[PDB]
Amino acid sequence: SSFFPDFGLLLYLEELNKEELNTFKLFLKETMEPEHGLTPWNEVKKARREDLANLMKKYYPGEKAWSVSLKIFGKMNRKDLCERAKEEINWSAQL
């Protein structure tokens, strides 16, 4: 359902350790620029996880914030997260 934007993004950010979260922010900067410009980066680079999930949903509404994060997990080699997402999305659609 609507689980993934409402709850999913934050839950997955919580599976990132401190170093991985910094890697995530850099991938996010790289994907948001130059289209979104330089304004969001100031929010991003100081945001804790809950704050990061919220600000992503401003620029990437609904499932878009979730979709952007998943691609980043794959690029940063957190393939365990990509696999869990597959499992969850596939089960949910079967409901």
Residue numbers in the entry: 7 to 101
From the paper:
NLRP14 PYD contains Leu at the central position 84, thereby breaking the charge bridge. To test the relevance of the proposed charge bridge to the pyrin-domain conformation, we introduced a L84R mutant to reconstitute the stabilizing charge bridge. The introduced positive charge of Arg84 bridges the negative charges of the opposing Glu26 and Asp86. This structure further confirms the proposed adaptive role of the hydrophobic residues Trp72, Leu76 and Leu87 that contribute to the hydrophobic core and thereby stabilize helix α6 within the bundle. With this crystal structure analysis we have identified a conformational regulation element (CRE) that allows us to predict the tendency of pyrin domains to adopt the closed or open conformation. Our previous structure-derived conclusions on the significance of the charge bridge/CRE suggested that the L84R mutant should adopt a stable six-helix bundle conformation. The L84R variant adopts a canonical death-domain fold with all six helices contributing to the stabilizing hydrophobic core. In quantitative terms, the hydrophobic core in the canonical six-helix bundle form (L84R) amounts to 2435 Å2, whereas the corresponding contact area will be reduced in the wild-type protein by approximately 490 Å2 to 1945 Å2, i.e. an approximate 20% reduction in the stabilizing interaction interface. By contrast, the L84R mutant crystallized in space group P21212 with one (monomeric) molecule per asymmetric unit. While the engineered L84R mutant showed remarkable properties such as a drastically improved thermal stability that correlates with a strictly monomeric six-α-helix structure, the naturally occurring D86V mutant behaved very much like the wild-type protein despite its severe physiological implications.
